[PDB]
């Protein structure tokens, strides 16, 4: 069992509404971790205990190269600590902003990593529910590291559960079924994937407005358009993901899963095996 005194803490890497992430070096091993720290009093006062429990429970189930790893948790009288892998290159969103628009090669590569990650997650019966570029981190080698699992859901295999009832997510990426039927499913993450692919190419996600209610109205009407020069096979893929009926999205269980998605023409040149060992294309 680790303790706070086992680490030397360095810079703050980020702050959330009820957490702070600090770079730390473990004294006994010299390894670096990103340690997420939460104050018990604050999470108790603000009804956040279930989110903290959920993040721990979901992350404990994951062991795949495209996810942030939870190595340990511990606590003291005041705080909870999550020891996470350190994603040195930060958020995918930073790069979309820096460059403006990804080229086709880079769009394909990063989309493929996200698809591979979702295949793994959905195979474990887990819905992310808040997939977006801020929650897709990058490691030192520029491979993805998906994070933010406190609003994820483990579907019960015992009841063959397909739908989850908590209202969570981010407006730009929220699925129409969550807005209208008040539940999400694995296919809700495929909707978010479509939004992300669009954003990589177009520079902004497809449903845009200055407030949430306006975004919701656009989502439920499928009110969006493509900019000029949007890579034609990517456009076709986005149109097969941004579908109002969640049972008709390419990659969903009712469309027979990830095989048909990975076979889409946009991915023709992708080698799906060992993507995490391939050198990513330079972002330029």
């Amino acid at each position: 069992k680790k303790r706070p005194e086992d680490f030397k803490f360095g810079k703050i890497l980020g702050e959330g509404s009820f957490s702070t992430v600090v770079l730390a070096r473990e004294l006994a091993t010299s390894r670096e971790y990103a340690i997420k720290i939460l104050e018990k009093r604050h999470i108790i006062k603000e009804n956040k205990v279930p989110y903290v429990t959920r993040e721990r429970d979901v992350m404990s189930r994951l062991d795949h190269p495209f996810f942030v790893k939870l190595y340990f948790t511990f606590q003291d009288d005041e705080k909870l600590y999550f020891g996470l892998s350190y994603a040195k290159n930060g958020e995918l969103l930073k790069y979309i902003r820096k460059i403006g628009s990804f080229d086709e090669t880079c769009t394909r590569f990063y989309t493929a990593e996200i698809v591979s990650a979702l295949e793994y997650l959905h195979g474990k019966g887990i819905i992310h529910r808040d997939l977006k570029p801020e929650n897709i981190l990058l490691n030192e080698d520029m491979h993805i590291q998906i994070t933010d699992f406190g609003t994820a859901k483990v579907l019960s295999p015992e009841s063959k559960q397909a739908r989850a009832n908590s209202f969570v997510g981010t407006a730009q990426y929220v699925s129409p079924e969550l807005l209208t039927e008040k539940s999400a499913c694995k296919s809700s993450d495929l909707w978010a994937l479509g939004c992300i692919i669009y954003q990589l190419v177009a520079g902004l996600p497809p449903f845009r407005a200055g407030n949430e209610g306006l975004i919701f109205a656009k989502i439920i009407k499928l009110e969006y358009d493509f900019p000029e020069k949007f890579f034609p096979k990517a456009r076709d893929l986005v149109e097969k993901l941004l579908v109002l009926d969640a049972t008709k999205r390419l990659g969903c269980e009712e469309m027979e899963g990830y095989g048909p998605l990975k076979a889409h023409p946009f991915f023709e040149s992708v080698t799906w095996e060992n993507l995490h060992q391939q050198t990513p294309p330079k972002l330029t």
Binding site: K40, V49, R56, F72, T73, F74
Partner: peptide
């Protein structure tokens, strides 16, 4: 609470 929080991979 937090009795079931501690964890080691």
């Amino acid at each position: 609470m937090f009795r079931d929080f501690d964890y080691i991979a």
